[PDB]
Amino acid sequence: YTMSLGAENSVAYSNNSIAIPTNFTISVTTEILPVSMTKTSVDCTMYICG
Amino acid sequence: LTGTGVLTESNKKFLPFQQFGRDIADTTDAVRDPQTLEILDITPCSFGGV
Amino acid sequence: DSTECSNLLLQYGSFCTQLNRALTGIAVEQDKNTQEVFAQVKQIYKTPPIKDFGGFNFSQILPDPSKPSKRSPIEDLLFNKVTNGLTVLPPLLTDEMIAQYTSALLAGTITSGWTFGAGPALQIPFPMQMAYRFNGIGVTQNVLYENQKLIANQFNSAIGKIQDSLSSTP
Amino acid sequence: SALGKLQDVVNQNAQALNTLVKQLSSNFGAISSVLNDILSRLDPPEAEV
Amino acid sequence: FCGKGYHLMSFPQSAPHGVVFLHVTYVPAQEKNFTTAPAICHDGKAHFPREGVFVSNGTHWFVTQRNFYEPQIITTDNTFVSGNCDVVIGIVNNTVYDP
């Protein structure tokens, strides 16, 4: 299929109307960020030659 | 087949056409003794960083 | 297509697998970059058919209906100004869908301000939104309202100068 | 797939190490990939090559 | 930068070779249409909101904070005066209460 960018949302714009929230949601989201790698050391002489 | 490693008694059961066993790096990690047909693991001697 | 060459190349191991894996990682990283830049909204916002924004003109940045590519005149000028085992993979997002993403972002920031980036898109008149932005930089709303025609004229002149500067500088 | 970002880093590091150890099994055009086989099979003038 | 929505706070959590941030954000919800005006014309003077916005439920005009509906009577304590009513485009007529 051709991938849908998203749902269409026609904002009801006019020159004298505003939308004010009457309520709220306390939303908790996760963000995972890598920090470090495995500290690997390779003996070059021992790797090549044993 | 020459090498250097600790020889220990092995739990692997070789088929009668098999003489040696290879690891990921194609080093002999298991070997059959040609006089008494028993299997030995060959763990390498300890390596450290000074 | 040489079989002897590939038989000798197998003696070197998995170098080719490493290079193909690195190029595949680069190729998917480009699509990840385009997703991270342009696909920040899950709603495709559209401008109203009547472009009454209190004197503010966005025709140089809104998509042109007469063009089949649905690009803005500025975006059309930007696209005009940029000119043995190798393959070029096409990007996951084509240029019209990237233009549609930018059009959705433009419609959201014009009709709703910064509200669509923090939740549901809340409609607001554009002079009032501009007044809010004026208060963000520490200038009172009255200054914006009193000099609104001048601000809209300056904004339209600057947008036209942007198009002229892009069309006149190689 | 919640923690996929850490798992990709771990998998890439383990895969790089695994490919590094797989590279020891290649002879690179020599007669064998084992140094001990070359030291036991050849005189030093060809063994140096 | 710190989650989707208006950022309130965040909590760090350790992870194997990584960090997990629990971003606590404020998301607006249950929005309602209102009729809005840039300024209020009273006694030949233009009144502008000090921190909020003028809203109307259909018959009466109020001033509320921008991110939450909390209508209050338009007074001289939450508005400021700048100029007359002839300059601001879209100014509407409404009374301004004096405490």
Ligand SMILES: *[C@@H]1O[C@H](CO)[C@@H](O[C@@H]2O[C@H](CO)[C@@H](O)[C@H](O)[C@H]2NC(C)=O)[C@H](O)[C@H]1NC(C)=O
């Ligand atoms: C604010 O009013 C507008 C129009 O007065 C509403 O937009 C309409 O919403 C309905 C239901 O989704 C649609 O069928 C109409 O086509 C919309 N009209 C327009 C012009 O967009 C809008 O939903 C109202 N907002 C709220 C929060 O009630």
Ligand SMILES: *[C@@H]1O[C@H](CO)[C@@H](O[C@@H]2O[C@H](CO)[C@@H](O)[C@H](O)[C@H]2NC(C)=O)[C@H](O)[C@H]1NC(C)=O
């Ligand atoms: C604002 O939204 C909250 C939910 O996020 C509403 O709280 C719910 O109200 C209904 C009806 O009173 C209850 O059945 C639910 O149990 C409530 N949920 C929670 C988590 O308390 C709240 O009523 C809304 N307030 C307004 C003014 O709209």
Ligand SMILES: *[C@@H]1O[C@H](CO)[C@@H](O[C@@H]2O[C@H](CO)[C@@H](O)[C@H](O)[C@H]2NC(C)=O)[C@H](O)[C@H]1NC(C)=O
């Ligand atoms: C917004 O700007 C566009 C262009 O900046 C205006 O379109 C011009 O209109 C005049 C008069 O009709 C024409 O002579 C030009 O050829 C038009 N230019 C282009 C590029 O189309 C437009 O009138 C402005 N106003 C509105 C409300 O759209």
Ligand SMILES: *[C@@H]1O[C@H](CO)[C@@H](O[C@@H]2O[C@H](CO)[C@@H](O)[C@H](O)[C@H]2NC(C)=O)[C@H](O)[C@H]1NC(C)=O
């Ligand atoms: C707009 O809000 C005002 C104030 O909240 C409403 O005025 C009140 O309406 C109730 C219900 O009829 C009356 O009991 C009160 O006496 C009214 N107060 C005043 C000071 O008039 C008004 O009805 C609301 N309008 C709409 C269309 O919802």
Ligand SMILES: *[C@@H]1O[C@H](CO)[C@@H](O[C@@H]2O[C@H](CO)[C@@H](O)[C@H](O)[C@H]2NC(C)=O)[C@H](O)[C@H]1NC(C)=O
């Ligand atoms: C808002 O109030 C002003 C002033 O009270 C109104 O302006 C008057 O309009 C009438 C008829 O249009 C004229 O006869 C007066 O001379 C005007 N006075 C001034 C000082 O301009 C204005 O019409 C009102 N607007 C609305 C929508 O009611």
Ligand SMILES: *[C@@H]1O[C@H](CO)[C@@H](O)[C@H](O)[C@H]1NC(C)=O
């Ligand atoms: C000699 O080697 C054979 C294997 O070829 C084995 O069966 C036998 O036990 C060995 N005898 C001695 C005395 O080592």
Ligand SMILES: *[C@@H]1O[C@H](CO)[C@@H](O)[C@H](O)[C@H]1NC(C)=O
């Ligand atoms: C809003 O537009 C209508 C026409 O659609 C016009 O009558 C009215 O004066 C405009 N108001 C403002 C504040 O521009």
